[PDB]
């Protein structure tokens, strides 16, 4: 059967937890991640400092075969990044025509719009992303912490980050896997 | 003066539990140093991810006293921190110091093993209970944190936002813990 893959894009600025509880979660699911940095395979400084260092860099991952989940962290800094970033508009466009799944999260829908993907789905950000990610009415807003429109799926923040990443392994490995994978973290 | 915050990082240490305490206590204005306890190269953490001590142990130690010393959890990561005599000497200096220690997921058997805070009403992950209560050297509790006076236990993952703003509470108060949580849109 394989495995399900996932590319998580790290860029400079990335919310750390955004991008560590998901990564976390979905290799517990069985899904093998790649943490990609974007600027290369140097080491990522991330909104609140901490350093991650990729798998590899945006630019092998890249070359690396179809991703069943391509996941936008959230962060000021990188999802500025992300939407100002040409390989990202074209991973982007890629996957969605592919009838892929991506998840953001945060202010990382916000590089959704800056790549214009998605035009008309439902969605949904932080509260304070919601005036960018909403002009030029692009989109339906939704207030739900985790919000799956399709082939879409968004989160409104680091409070939301295993709602987010539970609601990935679900939509990729299915119910049981997402269950079992639940349990041990002891959520509430 | 800002509080300050000592994270001691080893390898298999659960990553979401060193990541959450420490973005969130930096939110808090917490300077903090994120230890890696092998030295300063990078940290492979229980699933893989790698992260980049702020510097190593031995010269984050050297760096004045902290208000809080967190062990993060994992088997891994709490195995070696239990094994390291150098962690022995932090905390055992952070309790007489009367400063704040805290553990969570499999982090607080770190305490059992250097005999820190004995007697302590602590908790712990689920599967890490037996090995705590081993020699009924504690008191154990169910709550998804738990602060026995200077003594801080939370119980995993699913915990570490109210283990790190339970943190923050205890060393900036109600109101910036309450300032801190309002935008990571918790519920």
Excluded: W
């Amino acid at each position: 059967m394989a495995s399900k893959r996932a590319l998580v894009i790290l860029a400079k600025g990335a919310e750390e937890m955004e991008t560590v509880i998901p990564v976390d979660v979905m290799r517990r699911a069985g899904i093998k991640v790649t943490v990609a940095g974007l600027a290369g395979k140097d080491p990522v400084q991330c909104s609140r400092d901490v350093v991650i260092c990729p798998d590899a860099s945006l630019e092998d991952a890249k070359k690396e075969g179809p991703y069943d989940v391509v996941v936008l962290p959230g962060g000021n800094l990188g999802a500025q990044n992300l939407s100002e970033s040409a390989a990202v508009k074209e991973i982007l466009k890629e996957q969605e025509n592919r009838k892929g799944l991506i998840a953001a999260i945060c202010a990382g829908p916000t590089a959704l719009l800056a790549h214009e993907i998605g035009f008309g789905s439902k969605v949904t950000t932080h509260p304070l992303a919601k005036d960018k990610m909403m002009n030029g009415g692009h989109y339906t807003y939704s207030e739900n912490r985790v919000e799956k429109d399709g082939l879409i799926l968004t989160s409104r923040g680091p409070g939301t980050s295993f709602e987010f990443a539970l609601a990935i392994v679900e939509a990729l490995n299915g119910k049981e896997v997402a269950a079992q994978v639940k349990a041990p973290l002891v959520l509430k």
